[PDB]
Design a protein around this ligand. Sequence first.
Ligand SMILES: CC(C)(C)c1ccc(S(=O)(=O)NCc2ccc(C(=O)Nc3cccnc3)cc2)cc1
Ligand SMILES: CC(C)(C)c1ccc(S(=O)(=O)NCc2ccc(C(=O)Nc3cccnc3)cc2)cc1
Lengths: 469, 470
Amino acid sequence: EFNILLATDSYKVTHYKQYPPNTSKVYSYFECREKKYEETVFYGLQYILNKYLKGKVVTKEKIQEAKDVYKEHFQDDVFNEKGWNYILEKYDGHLPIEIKAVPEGFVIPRGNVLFTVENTDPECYWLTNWIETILVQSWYPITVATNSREQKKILAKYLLETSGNLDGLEYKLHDFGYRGVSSQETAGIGASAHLVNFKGTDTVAGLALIKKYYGTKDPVPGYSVPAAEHSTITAWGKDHEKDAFEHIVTQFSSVPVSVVSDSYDIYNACEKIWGEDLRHLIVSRSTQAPLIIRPDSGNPLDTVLKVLEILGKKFPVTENSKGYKLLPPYLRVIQGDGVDINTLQEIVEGMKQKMWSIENIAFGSGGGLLQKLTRDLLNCSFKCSYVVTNGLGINVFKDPVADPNKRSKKGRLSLHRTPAGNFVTLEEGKGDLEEYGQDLLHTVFKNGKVTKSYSFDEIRKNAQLNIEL
Amino acid sequence: EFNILLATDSYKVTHYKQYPPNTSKVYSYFECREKKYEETVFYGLQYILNKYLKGKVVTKEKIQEAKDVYKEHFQDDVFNEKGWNYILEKYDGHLPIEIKAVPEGFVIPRGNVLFTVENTDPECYWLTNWIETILVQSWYPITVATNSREQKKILAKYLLETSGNLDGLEYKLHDFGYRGVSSQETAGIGASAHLVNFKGTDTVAGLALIKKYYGTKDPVPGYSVPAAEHSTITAWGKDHEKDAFEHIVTQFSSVPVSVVSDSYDIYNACEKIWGEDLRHLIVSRSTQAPLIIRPDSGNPLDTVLKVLEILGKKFPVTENSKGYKLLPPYLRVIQGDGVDINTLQEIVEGMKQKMWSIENIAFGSGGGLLQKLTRDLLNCSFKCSYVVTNGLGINVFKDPVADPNKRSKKGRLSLHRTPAGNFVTLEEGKGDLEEYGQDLLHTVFKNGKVTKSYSFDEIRKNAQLNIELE
Ligand SMILES: CC(C)(C)c1ccc(S(=O)(=O)NCc2ccc(C(=O)Nc3cccnc3)cc2)cc1
Ligand SMILES: CC(C)(C)c1ccc(S(=O)(=O)NCc2ccc(C(=O)Nc3cccnc3)cc2)cc1
């Protein structure tokens, strides 16, 4: 089983001896510090609260386990057994902590308080920052959700421009990232964050996470269709690629099907195999069951353009009301290699310059979507801003001489709407003056209980783009 | 409850219908495909085999769960209920798969077969690639271990050059990455991979993973010491940084202690607080209990060099036998901000140019060590190379016209020692010709059972640097 006493950075085990004597309160906050990605989607804390922080998280056995581990790890007895004992005895092992947070799905500009943490019992002043490590991992679903939303903005802009509407936008970026992330747990968290913005995923782990921790009215939050991989093509033998294609599209004749087409020669496959030998099997398909051709190698922009060029000459292309070229409805393309936020932009802009509608294409992204992200992207950070020592509150902060970007906020914080309807974080307990309407932070956790929860439907509503509003 | 029927890429649910009819065997392999990182440390498969693949992994309940999920996810019944039920009924839910692998800890040049997978029952031809997704996640511990070892090579070169030995090498790169990875599970996996090469870690999750899945003779594989964070300094108030410093070093007077010193002004902290006001509390400390000063902001190289110059004028510096400057034994530095393999190289070279021994310094790395890595780095990839259809074996491969780097290997594979003692991968079943001696892969998994495994001590031995060996 998971042991919260072993789920912190080692050095934090020693911090109870380092704070000022007579400290009864340590109050800390999380922000995506201002330093590109001007606003972030707050998502993922509810998962952490439920899986790791709520209920009886301290037991006699867990305390002894930690004591034994830290004895060897530090070669010294430094572990605060007395402090953990107190929580076990007084609170039946529930954490005396209060966390207040902005609603999940909320889109907030950089440099604003997103959640705060403080101890509710003076004996547990040390506990606030014990749980920094576990809480800071919220950086990941925040960053995946944010980066996914930024790609949706790019897709929406170009889809609207080239088609006149946003039909199909929520299926334009498919999660291919299950194999490319660092763990099973990561896969679930990351896939769920992408699903805040889109509905197409192959990362099955995301579905179970959403069902367990968030919930949706619909049976599932994400969908897929039958699709080939290189192995189901190559297994037929080099000389039988056409037989593989024919078998697969016939097996899946009445649903959408994606067929990876670059095993040997993507251009030959498009022009000769799909475009001639098997054309009769494609032009007969329903609009609700297109063939989706999938290139998977070469320069992503150059390959997409060449594939469209080939297909446009073998299949009947129309010109939409915006003046952009459109493949027949039984034929589409998905580019699922080398896609990240930067290359996505390059591809849709290249398509627009060549007069191809974004209606023609969808994207798959794996490592770019779920793995190629760090805590530095949005500067997700947790800092102490207020302590009470000898009954007096003190506003505290860091402000390193050589890096003003690392200065932290001072005092008790609150988040408010400005008169123009934007966001502002008030420092130094100024929220108490009541000049800025209600605090947007809500208590979500208190003394071992989750006190406020959001459904996945609510989160999706909060995270909507302006364009779709 | 983890459910292997829900632990694959969605599209793989539909693949059993796409293979050629009457296919009885699918054989696939994993490599770090050849495209800075010329050799890789193979590590992490044993964790995956034990946690996720071994024993009864299929139950009636798990089949029903998967059936219900995929029905909604595909809006259709496409899920191979019959195929999974066959495994349940015939093998008590144990996977009819055989996996052969190179020993864990082995250091192997890019483009070699690292492991192979095939089904052991013709009915389960579809199972080989079902588990691609979960096995390909081995990229992560491989890549962490490899990148960590590459940093160790850099540290060894400069430590040897500036000091004449490698004392302390295994504590030169400390894992600070627990908060900066994407999940608790990732933290344990990544931290364990770093511990293949080093012994200093704050990512506690790695200890329990190693103990459970690998094992060591020592009670724990990794160690740490008391250390401050910004909150334990700043909580004292801006005008009381000296009081914080004094309290902390007095609390930890007889063990090593690291104190973050850049809350307000690192240069003032070093020159005036440590170098003057509290100097008497530092020069009194044991060699076994140094103050370790931690800067955490600014240009990493410029800041390290300036901190060292400041301390060198406030404390007695010696010149070691190699001609490099050395702080007294009660005083050291750790640079734990902005460290990745690139900036590490830059810092130690900069120190060498300014005649400072690498003995003076250690590094902490967080996101750079455990998170800022992708499957692309070593091109970790799983591909089908051999199938049997209608009783005929076929050597299969991809070879995309626009990217020769993505060409995959053909046929049955084996790994061998060359006459010069290097590794070579033989394709097309040619290992059977016996011109290259025995296959170096070992069967590690067969029909639900782990059949070969390695202790963490063995893995560490396999992963040693040549310079450590010599
Ligand atoms: C559900 C609905 C019918 C609306 C639909 C959703 C999504 C698409 S799509 O074209 O955006 N994506 C379908 C798809 C699914 C999986 C794969 C695929 O190749 N997945 C995969 C997974 C992991 C690694 N590599 C590839 C390709 C296309 C089409 C229709
Ligand atoms: C165990 C032994 C006595 C040999 C030893 C090991 C390692 C060092 S070290 O100086 O390489 N590292 C000690 C250390 C530990 C933790 C921190 C620290 O600040 N950790 C931390 C963790 C997470 C985030 N940020 C910082 C700093 C120095 C010194 C002695």
